[PDB]
Design a protein around this motif. Sequence first.
Motif, mmCIF file in Angstrom:
data_model
loop_
_atom_site.group_PDB
_atom_site.id
_atom_site.type_symbol
_atom_site.label_atom_id
_atom_site.label_comp_id
_atom_site.label_asym_id
_atom_site.label_seq_id
_atom_site.Cartn_x
_atom_site.Cartn_y
_atom_site.Cartn_z
ATOM 1 N N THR A 82 15.625 19.984 9.916
ATOM 2 C CA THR A 82 16.981 20.144 10.418
ATOM 3 C C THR A 82 17.427 18.855 11.113
ATOM 4 O OG1 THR A 82 16.719 22.533 10.686
ATOM 5 C CG2 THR A 82 18.446 21.466 11.985
ATOM 6 N N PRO A 83 18.529 18.237 10.686
ATOM 7 C CA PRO A 83 18.931 16.964 11.307
ATOM 8 C C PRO A 83 19.335 17.122 12.762
ATOM 9 C CG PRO A 83 19.967 17.234 9.163
ATOM 10 C CD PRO A 83 19.368 18.558 9.521
ATOM 11 N N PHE A 84 18.914 16.152 13.578
ATOM 12 C CA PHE A 84 19.362 16.073 14.965
ATOM 13 C C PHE A 84 20.843 15.735 15.055
ATOM 14 C CE2 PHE A 84 20.215 13.569 18.792
ATOM 15 C CZ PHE A 84 19.729 14.388 19.787
ATOM 16 N N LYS A 85 21.352 14.953 14.101
ATOM 17 C CA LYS A 85 22.686 14.360 14.183
ATOM 18 C C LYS A 85 23.307 14.371 12.792
ATOM 19 C CE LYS A 85 24.968 10.119 15.808
ATOM 20 N NZ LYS A 85 24.620 8.744 16.255
ATOM 21 N N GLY A 86 24.315 15.215 12.596
ATOM 22 C CA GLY A 86 25.008 15.250 11.316
ATOM 23 C C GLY A 86 24.061 15.541 10.173
ATOM 24 N N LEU A 142 15.003 25.294 6.918
ATOM 25 C CA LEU A 142 14.277 24.069 7.210
ATOM 26 C C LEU A 142 13.674 24.158 8.592
ATOM 27 C CD1 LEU A 142 16.717 21.333 5.860
ATOM 28 C CD2 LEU A 142 14.679 22.254 4.752
ATOM 29 N N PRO A 143 12.550 23.484 8.803
ATOM 30 C CA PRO A 143 11.970 23.452 10.145
ATOM 31 C C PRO A 143 12.884 22.702 11.094
ATOM 32 C CG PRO A 143 10.906 21.818 8.785
ATOM 33 C CD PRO A 143 11.822 22.597 7.875
ATOM 34 N N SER A 144 12.868 23.128 12.349
ATOM 35 C CA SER A 144 13.554 22.426 13.427
ATOM 36 C C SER A 144 12.471 22.044 14.427
ATOM 37 C CB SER A 144 14.637 23.292 14.058
ATOM 38 O OG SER A 144 15.463 22.519 14.911
ATOM 39 N N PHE A 145 12.009 20.801 14.345
ATOM 40 C CA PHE A 145 10.888 20.327 15.140
ATOM 41 C C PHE A 145 11.388 19.481 16.301
ATOM 42 C CE2 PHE A 145 8.281 20.597 11.057
ATOM 43 C CZ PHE A 145 7.673 21.776 11.438
ATOM 44 N N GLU A 146 10.745 19.647 17.453
ATOM 45 C CA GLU A 146 10.899 18.745 18.585
ATOM 46 C C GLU A 146 9.545 18.643 19.263
ATOM 47 O OE1 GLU A 146 14.294 19.367 21.016
ATOM 48 O OE2 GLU A 146 13.633 18.027 22.617
ATOM 49 N N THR A 147 9.066 17.418 19.456
ATOM 50 C CA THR A 147 7.720 17.174 19.956
ATOM 51 C C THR A 147 7.803 16.250 21.156
ATOM 52 O OG1 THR A 147 6.803 17.450 17.732
ATOM 53 C CG2 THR A 147 5.411 16.376 19.379
ATOM 54 N N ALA A 148 7.283 16.710 22.291
ATOM 55 C CA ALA A 148 7.197 15.911 23.503
ATOM 56 C C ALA A 148 5.947 15.046 23.459
ATOM 57 C CB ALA A 148 7.167 16.809 24.739
ATOM 58 N N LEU A 149 6.086 13.799 23.902
ATOM 59 C CA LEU A 149 5.038 12.798 23.738
ATOM 60 C C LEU A 149 4.878 11.955 24.994
ATOM 61 C CD1 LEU A 149 6.062 11.735 20.128
ATOM 62 C CD2 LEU A 149 4.039 13.064 20.758
#
Lengths: 8, 95
Positions: free
Chosen positions: B28-32, A1-8
Amino acid sequence: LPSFETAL
Amino acid sequence: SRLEQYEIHIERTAAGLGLSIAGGKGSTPFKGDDDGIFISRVTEAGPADLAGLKVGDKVIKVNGIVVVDADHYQAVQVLKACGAVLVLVVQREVT
């Protein structure tokens, strides 16, 4: 699965 | 630990919102096993920090727009596009 984090 | 629901009034500035989001439906979940939208970063003295946003907050609504079931791209576009002022409804664990 993708692991996304986006700064805004 | 109380689960509380808060409104956070963020005024967009030249530095954006001053927050990062992680998670989203199908990612991918951030939490659990909760693949919702969570605040992963808050810029010190940025708009979100001034408004009281905290890392680990779960984003529920943006200016009345629900994003509880949003995928990541959906939430990014709502947060980018949907106002000079963003009233976020968030859920937070409180001592």
